[PDB]
Each structure stands twice: as structure tokens, then as C-alpha cells.
């Protein structure tokens, strides 16, 4: 049937890196979220401007799903009107922002022995990212008053470090995969109709 | 009636500045977004940038960057698009088109998935020696 | 290049049916955002032909019709008339380039 092609979302194999944080639009279908709000493997669920129990009697023109991974302590960032390296230069939610905010412990696959540093995070920037910008931007930052000439050295900085996921490490150093449902409403019908 | 409408032709030399205009007529004006459309010669339709003007919240593309500035006046309900040195390559067509929902909340953040239904006549711009 | 690719012409006589193809990818309807194509008849501006992927605004005729499949889109043209000569434009949004427009193609309509 139209079922709402979440799960490739959620069970994807591979995920995005926080400062390239992938976006998939879903519409035409119905979308029981029942999947989510009922299961116990999900770390945080955390819903703005909606409760889940309500959303399976509920219609949205479109809805986005955003997906990444970041650290444990950082997961809290993922929400209106926080502050962090993550929430500011990496992937912010507007203070007026509809949808949810589930994440999980991924430690089994995104982390290995000797660590895994293919997950990265922008670090410096010369501005906040608005709410839902995102930058894929590799300019060598400029700490000083010395122009860089797009050479790293000293005061120019590289934006971008890789995490280091171990698997041994604290619960808050582990890797978290998070998803974040957007709700839009609009005046055209509804079809994101979820039973 | 839902219209824009822009600045006349312009004949410029190279170095000189050009602010041209889009004025709004028949819509909320801070509610739905413009974007500048560029039609070079030979080349196809391409977007300079972006701007909310309830909010001035304005987002460029890179083969842009440094040599323009978008602007919104709320009060006279117009868009402005600026050049501080121009060059004769800028020479072409420059359209202004009106995108979004022009509904607040939510669907702001997403009307750069929509169409640019109002469009304007154009200006068309030239620079020579 | 463009992120959306498109012909650079399609011919066709009085009344016959043609397609203009739009090609894009994972970051631009991959992702699951729709196409809006734009009509830019000669010493015109580009004007709204069909939004939403298959959706016409009024005044535009039925004979101008809109899909999209996978990763790429349609647009078909049937009863060909003179007056359909124009540059076509296809658009969407990339996740890293944000809107996007297609190269255009030029429609003949040899009669």
C-alpha cells in the first residue's frame, strides 16, 4: 500500500555527517507512526509543538525528515533555542519549529576498535547558521587578521573536525544516530494521512 | 491584481553602481519571498538569491557572492538588487519572481520548495565602454 | 554544468506530440521534492506552466501535461501548435544547492 517510506529513514545503513545532515522529503502516504512512539529502542523522543499520541489522527501537507549523527552530551542541542557548537554551527530548529526529535545509541555500528573518524562536525564559523541552513563549506577559517589565502597554518583553521567513536568510550562520547521529523501544513490537502 | 513590477533598462560603464527594483502590487508583501533571476546571454535561468522581507532575511548563491546586495524595503513594498563595481560580463536580463506560501510558522522554512508563480517583466542591463 | 539536466532542443510538426525530459538526482527529487517547469515565450518574460510536478495554473491548456518518476521528469506536449515555440525551463530544490533550474530547451514547431 502508500505506506510513508519512513524506515528507509530510520533503518538506513549508512548516515550523514552533522555538518552535511541529510534531508528527504515524504508526502502522498499514510504513515503510522505507532512504529515510533511505541518503541523502546529510541533513546530520546522529544515532540515540539505536538504530542506523538496525537499525530496518527492528524494530516500534514508534507513532512521532512532530517538525519545525522552526533555525540550523547550533544543530542540535547537538537532542540529550539539551544546553544552548542552542534546547535549553532552544525543544525539549528527554528523557535517556532512543529515536529520531533528521536535518537538512538549507535555505538554497535558507527563506532570500531582503534575508533571511527569518518563522522565530522564543523568546529568555526564566522556566523550562527539560521534555523535550517545548512553549510558544506570547506574555507579555511580566519582567526586573526592575517588573510588565509586558502592555506591552513597559523590563525587558519581547517572548519571541519572528525569525532572519534570508540567503542569503549562513556555513554555521552558514543555515537547517536537522531532523526527529526518536520510538520508543514499548508492550505492544499493534506496527504500525509497517517491511520 | 498579483503583479511585480522592475526598474527600466540601464546603460552603464564598468565600475559604475546599479540598484534596480521590484515593487509588489496586489499581496502581502512580508509574507511571500523574492528571489532574482538572472538570464545571461546564451546561458539559461539562474538564481542570485533570496530574500523574506518581512525579516530582511536574504540568502545568496556563491557565483554571487561580494559583488551584489539584495534589499527589501517594507514600507514601499519593494526589492532591491545592487551592484557596487559593475562588469561587463553582468551585462543580461535580471528577473524578480515571488515564491512561497505566504503563510507564517512552519511552512516558511520550506517555501524554497515552491514555484515562482508572480513573475516580473524584467530589466535588462548593459554594460560597455 | 546544471544539477538538473535537460535537452538542449526538441523538434516537432503541428499536432504532434513531443516530450521534454528533466533529469536530476538523490539531492533534487531523489529526495523527494517536486518539479515546477517555466515557459519563456519569445520577447517575453518566463512565466508559471506547470507547478507540483503535474499541476497546470489557469490558462494554461490541457494539452501541456507533467510527471515525475525515480529521478527524473516529464514534460509532454501534445496537438503541437506555433504558439508552443518557446524555451522550456524545468526547476526544483537541491539539498546543497538549494532551487535549481534546468539548462531550458528550445521547442520548433516547423510549419
Known amino acids: 500500500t502508500n505506506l510513508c517510506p519512513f524506515g528507509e529513514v530510520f533503518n538506513a545503513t549508512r548516515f550523514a555527517s552533522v555538518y552535511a545532515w541529510n534531508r528527504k522529503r515524504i508526502s502522498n502516504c499514510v504513515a503510522d507512526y505507532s512504529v515510533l512512539y511505541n518503541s523502546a529502542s529510541f533513546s530520546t523522543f522529544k515532540c515540539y509543538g505536538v504530542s506523538p499520541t496525537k499525530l496518527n489522527d492528524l494530516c500534514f501537507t508534507n513532512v521532512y525528515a532530517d538525519s545525522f549523527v552526533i555525540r550523547g552530551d550533544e543530542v540535547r542541542q537538537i532542540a529550539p533555542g539551544q546553544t552548542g557548537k552542534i546547535a549553532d554551527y552544525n543544525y539549528k530548529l527554528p523557535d517556532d519549529f512543529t515536529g520531533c526529535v528521536i535518537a538512538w545509541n549507535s555505538n554497535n555500528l558507527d563506532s570500531k576498535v582503534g575508533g571511527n573518524y569518518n563522522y565530522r562536525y564543523r568546529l568555526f564559523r564566522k556566523s550562527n547558521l539560521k534555523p535550517f541552513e545548512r553549510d558544506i563549506s570547506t574555507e579555511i577559517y580566519q582567526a586573526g587578521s592575517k588573510p588565509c589565502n586558502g592555506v591552513e597554518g597559523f590563525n587558519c583553521y581547517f572548519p571541519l573536525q572528525s569525532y572519534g567513536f570508540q567503542p569503549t568510550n562513556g555513554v555521552g562520547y558514543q555515537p547517536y544516530r537522531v532523526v527529526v521529523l518536520s510538520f508543514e501544513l499548508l492550505h492544499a490537502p493534506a496527504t500525509v494521512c497517517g491511520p | 491584481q498579483v503583479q511585480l513590477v522592475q526598474s527600466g533598462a540601464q546603460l552603464k560603464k564598468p565600475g559604475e553602481s546599479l540598484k534596480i527594483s521590484c515593487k509588489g502590487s496586489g499581496y502581502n508583501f512580508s509574507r511571500y519571498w523574492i528571489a532574482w533571476v538572472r538570464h545571461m546571454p546564451g546561458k539559461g535561468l539562474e538564481v542570485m538569491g533570496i530574500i523574506y522581507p518581512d525579516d530582511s532575511d536574504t540568502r545568496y548563491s556563491p557565483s554571487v557572492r561580494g559583488q551584489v546586495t539584495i534589499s527589501a524595503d517594507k514600507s514601499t513594498s519593494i526589492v532591491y538588487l545592487q551592484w557596487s563595481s559593475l562588469k561587463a560580463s553582468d551585462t543580461g536580463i535580471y528577473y524578480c519572481?515571488?515564491?512561497?506560501?505566504?503563510?507564517?510558522?512552519?511552512?516558511?522554512?520550506?517555501?524554497?520548495?515552491?514555484?515562482?508563480?508572480?513573475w516580473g517583466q524584467g530589466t535588462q542591463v548593459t554594460v560597455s565602454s | 554544468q546544471s544539477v538538473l539536466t535537460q535537452p538542449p532542443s526538441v523538434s516537432g510538426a503541428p499536432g504532434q506530440r513531443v516530450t521534454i525530459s528533466c533529469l536530476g538526482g538523490?539531492?533534487?527529487?531523489?529526495?523527494?521534492?517536486?518539479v515546477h517547469w517555466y515557459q519563456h515565450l519569445p520577447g517575453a518574460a518566463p512565466k508559471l506552466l506547470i507547478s507540483?510536478?503535474?499541476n497546470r495554473p489557469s490558462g494554461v491548456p490541457a494539452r501541456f501535461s507533467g510527471s515525475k518518476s525515480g529521478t527524473s521528469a516529464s514534460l509532454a506536449i501534445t496537438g503541437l501548435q506555433a504558439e508552443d515555440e518557446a524555451d522550456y525551463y524545468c526547476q526544483s530544490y537541491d539539498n546543497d544547492l538549494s532551487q535549481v533550474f534546468g539548462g531550458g530547451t528550445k521547442l520548433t514547431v516547423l510549419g
Open positions: 519572481a515571488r515564491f512561497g506560501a505566504g503563510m507564517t510558522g512552519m511552512p516558511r522554512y520550506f517555501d524554497t520548495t515552491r514555484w515562482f508563480d508572480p
Open positions: 507540483g510536478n503535474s
Open positions: 538523490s539531492s533534487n527529487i531523489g529526495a523527494g521534492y517536486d
